[model samples]
Target: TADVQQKLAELERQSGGRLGVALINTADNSQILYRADERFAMCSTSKVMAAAAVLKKSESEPNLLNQRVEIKKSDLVNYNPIAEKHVNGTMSLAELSAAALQYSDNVAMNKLIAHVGGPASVTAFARQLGDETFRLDRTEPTLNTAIPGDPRDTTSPRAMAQTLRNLTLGKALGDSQRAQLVTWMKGNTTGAASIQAGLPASWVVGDKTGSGGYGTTNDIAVIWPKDRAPLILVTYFTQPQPKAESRRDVLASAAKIVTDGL
Candidate 1:
């Protein structure tokens, strides 16, 4: 374990920014934390929580996911190419959720939050999962506009990893609900350069990524290695980088370290 910690610290020093990592073994609940309790901007990673909230509400309203919601042109938000492409159209909640989870569509996420009530509903869902440090206080675009040091949608590495673990272990949702959530997550295409990149092809990674101004690149993932038990890996970087790709590389390197050590 010290080897993994030392490797993570090495990566942290090389990062030249704040880096938080949480790795959990789902089979035995063993974990490693590197500044994992410290908070960071969750960015689009909060979309995963929003999806969880929607799925939780679907328990009573089984038709919730199938209900169609209209996407007006006015709902379009910057930095969301997917939403821009689908403006002035209607999509079922399931389709919107797929777009949100796979592509991190800002409008899709905002619509889902509205569908579940508001930001408070997302927080309530996190609370139900036993998370105290994760919060979804702002919607998209507005969340993107937040100034430095503003507390816009924050979570700790530990909390995010725990949430993913709960989802995997069925603590956060029922078996059927968790299956849907994990299916969407497995289809995530936005985080290709982060944790998933560092892993071997034999491994399967289901993840969500978050990025923002101020050098932020975050990823929370469920990793399943060949012939090995599954694990949760959460990586957050807060220090400013000249290019976003560099931070993704840092995450990739960190993930490789954990996988190789394990």
Candidate 2:
């Protein structure tokens, strides 16, 4: 406990400004260590929920996953020009979820949103999980927003942490559905390099990063130690000076603080 306490204290000093962190022990659902509970924008991290909604629908409704949902020209929300050339065709629900998680593929995410119902479904799912302040608030009802506008997607440090807890404990998805959700996170396409910046090479972290600049900048992720339960970590940095890397380093530092102890 001394090691974790000291590390977190050090991270606070190092941040030089506002920063928040949360950690939960999955082995036993007894504790949550955190800082700041205010809502902050949740950027691409929204995909995790979107992904879960898809899998939930798939499990409850047998015919959903097998349906060949096409990725038509209209479904192309924010596909990379380069990647677009490669997938300018149809994709199934499974394929769309993969692309969304693997590449933070916005196009795939938007398509999934449509297939699983809509943004309303994602919001409903979040509310069911008791996430009062978290929702995928993307404009245009697409996964990728070239320029997200007013009332950006928001989530509190505590809410994001709870989501992670729900995820690992299979509360977010039923026992039959958790594995699929974890699979998507394990294959997350963004923030790999950023969150891993502070940990030793041997450490493996499972996370999703949202990068955008409006009024806030942040990254929310879960860290997995080689032989222990995973820890939920969230960082919200506002008006980061110099560059976003500073905020990233802050995030990694905060994660390393907790992980070094476990």
Candidate 3:
């Protein structure tokens, strides 16, 4: 453990910019192995909580999914013409949720925020999950535009790890609800090519990546290994133009370095 810490500290020092890592052992039952309190602009990770909130609300009111909602052209996010084409289009609540998680479709996300309720309800659900640092800071339009407004939209590695832990333990939601959450999460693939640049082919990971201008990046993954304990890891980084290869390597190396020590 000490060696892992030393190596991680060296990596953190040499990272040349903001970086945070949090690792928890779901099998051995540990809290966190590395920096857990560091906060960073969670970026798209907020979508996870957003989906959760909608799902919870939908469950309470079964009609939520049955109701037809219209998507307006102006509600679409940057460069989302395909989704825009669907504007003025009517989709069920389930379809909107699918678009948000499956495609990271911004238009669908905005629509869900509007139709399923607003940031207030989403924030409440996140808090109820014990995600004090997780939130949807920007309103629909601003968030899609990449405009930075609320710092509280930020999240810490600690919160993500905890959330994943809760999900695994059926503490975040009921069995059916948790299953649905994971199903949607497994559909997230916006950054799969980058975050999963390393590691073996057989190891399946459920993760979401967030990126913004000036090298604002974040990733949280649930690593599944058939033989060993499943691990949840979250890493956030900032720089001018950090290479995805380097970042991925750094994350992969850090995960190994910590696990080996443990």
Candidate 4:
């Protein structure tokens, strides 16, 4: 336990900024927290919650995932290269969720939010899952317009880790539905340079990433080791940075430390 605490402390020092981390061992429900209650901007990481809302709606609607939505050129918002390529086309709800989750496509995210009703719908769903501080109020293109002290989307590391734990336990979705969400996350390429980069080859991680101006880099994940119980890890970094990749590596180092300790 001392080794774990020491490695975690080293990670905090290496971060060079405000860093929040939460690690939960699903087997025993044990956890480690470092500034875990502090709130950080969710950025694109909000897509996971949006996806969950959509999946939850599907339970009663049944045909929701199969519903088709058209994407217009104007819908291709900034910071979304993947959705831009598919402009002026149509995709099913499931396909759009995959694009948003796997590639962090802003257009797909906005569309999903609309399909799920609106920002209030996502916020309501978060509350339903027992998250007290999580919020979703703005769309992707207007992310930069967020107030300095009060961002549109924000969450604490502890709340996010708990959300991931609940998802794994089928709290918000059925077993098959949760598995589908995890599969999309496991196929995610956006966070490859962060937490997943530090993991061993034998370990599998399903994660979502969030990045914005002013050196904001965050990742939340479900990690599965070959011979150990699965765990949830959430990390957040909010400060100025010279290069995004540097912060990503810092996160990777922290992830490696945690994994090694385990």
TM-score of each: 0.94, 0.80, 0.83, 0.92
For model 2, residues 63-111, the per-residue Cα lDDT tens digits are 6665676555665554443236545555667766776666766776676
Q: What ranking emerges by lDDT with the best candidate at the front?
A: 1, 4, 3, 2
75-108 per-residue lDDT for model 1 (tens digits): 9887666777766778889988988999999999
Q: How would you encode candidate 4's per-residue C-alpha lDDT over 144-209 as one tens digit per residue?
A: 332336656888889998987787654678766788899999999888888888888788999999
What tens digits encode model 3's per-residue C-alpha lDDT throughout 1-262? Answer: 5766788788777765556778777786775556578666676666667766776776678677667777776666663533766777787767777766666677766766666468777777778777777767665445522233336557778887777667644466667777777776667656565445444566667776666544566677777765778787777665544342235556655556655533
Lowest-sum lDDT 10-residue window in model 1: 143-152
The Cα error of candidate 4 at residue 54, in Å, is 0.2
Candidate 3 all-Cα RMSD: 3.4
TM-score sort, best first: 1, 4, 3, 2
- Model 1 scores a C-alpha lDDT of 0.84
Q: Pick the candidate with the highest TM-score.
A: 1
In angstroms, how far off is 89's CA in candidate 1? 2.0
The better-scoring model by TM-score among 1 and 3 is: 1
Q: What is the alpha-carbon lDDT of model 4 when measured against the actual structure?
A: 0.81
lDDT of 4 at 216: 78
Best by lDDT: 1
Q: Which pairs of residues have clashing backbones in candidate 4?
A: none
lDDT of each candidate versus the true structure: 0.84, 0.64, 0.65, 0.81
How high is the lDDT of residue 54 in model 3? Answer: 72
- Report residue 153 deviation for candidate 4 (angstroms): 1.1
Which pairs clash (backbone N, Cα, C closer than 3 Å) in model 3?
A: 71-88
